[PDB]
Design a protein around this ligand. Sequence first.
Ligand code: CL
Ligand code: CL
Lengths: 32, 32, 32
Amino acid sequence: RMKQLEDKIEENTSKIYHNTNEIARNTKLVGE
Amino acid sequence: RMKQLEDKIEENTSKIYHNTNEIARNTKLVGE
Amino acid sequence: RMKQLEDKIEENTSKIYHNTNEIARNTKLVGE
Ligand SMILES: [Cl-]
Ligand SMILES: [Cl-]
């Protein structure tokens, strides 16, 4: 199971990575 | 411990799911 | 390995925590 769990953690890390970039884009677009 | 760790991973997956939707809403609202 | 995996999960939890706050800021700034 542990390798799969490491898989799942990495899938979450990747989703977070992309979300962080999208948030940054929104932050810039709402900024003055 | 492993079942609890799977729990925690799922709690993070769920938080990511909701954040992704909220980010999408912000993206649309900042869009032209 | 399990302690390290718990580490990694917590690093993701922390990234999510900060992203949630930033999303909230963007939500308020796009709000009427
Ligand atoms: Cl995770
Ligand atoms: Cl956002």
